Every structure is written in structure tokens, then in C-alpha cells.
Amino acid sequence: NPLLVQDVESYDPVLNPVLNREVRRTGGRVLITLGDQDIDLSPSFVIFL
Amino acid sequence: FNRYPLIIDPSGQATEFIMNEYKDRKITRTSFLDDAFRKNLESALRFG
């Protein structure tokens, strides 16, 4: 789902892999390591700060 | 099947039939003795 995030002056470093597109493709899935858990990154995801 | 099947294939034809049948769904062959069984099971449980 598209996401709009306000107050970027309080930026959360949890978004660093998401902004850097540090994805791990394995078995047809696109994995993003937000924090300590793996998440299937849907291609339709988009974030605006 | 309702319960997960247990295949008895001394000739080895059933296992290759299984690999061919579920190849389109990215089937993975593993074993109980392998130390990677934990991660394979965990990946299967979360991503099909």
C-alpha cells in the first residue's frame, strides 16, 4: 500500500533498508529485513516522506 | 490427501514425480538429517 509519512525531521532509521532497497530475492519472494523480521516486499509498495 | 502424505518409494520414481509436479511452485527437497531443515521448514511455513 502507498504510504505517506510526515515529520521526517524525526526520521526513524528503521527505514534505511527500505530506502536503500536492500532486498533479498529467494524462491520468487522479495524479502526486506525491517528490523529483525523478514517481510515480503510487494512491488506496489511506495513511500513518500 | 487430508493428512500430509508419507511416500514409500523404493524405486525413487515417486520422488521425481513429486519434484516435477510441484516444480512450478518452487518445491525444495530436504531431509530430516540435514541441519538446514529448520530454516527450510520455517521458510515453507511463512512463504508457501
Nearest-angstrom CA–CA distance, B20 and B27: 9
Is residue A27 within 8 A of residue B47, CB to CB? The reply is: yes
Nearest-angstrom CA–CA distance, A29 and B17: 25
A34-43 burial: b if 16+ Cβ within 10 Å, else e? eeeebeebee
Which H helix or E strand runs over A16?
A: helix A16-20
Which chain B residues are Cβ-neighbours of A28 within 8 angstroms? 26
> What's B14's DSSP letter?
H
Q: Which residues contact A3 (CB under 8 A, 6 or more apart)?
A: A45, A46, A47, A48
How many Cβ contacts (< 8 angstroms) between chains A and B? 9
Q: What is the resolution of this structure in A?
A: 2.9
Is residue A24 within 8 A of residue A31, CB to CB? The reply is: yes
Nearest-angstrom CA–CA distance, A9 and A17: 18
Nearest-angstrom CA–CA distance, B19 and B29: 8
Which H helix or E strand runs over B17?
A: helix B13-21
> What's B5's DSSP letter?
P
Inter-chain residue contact A28 with B43, CB threshold 8 Å = no
Q: Which residues contact B30 (CB under 8 A, 6 or more apart)?
A: B36, B37, B40
- Identify how the structure was determined: cryo-EM
> How many Cα neighbours within 13 Å face the side chain of A28?
9
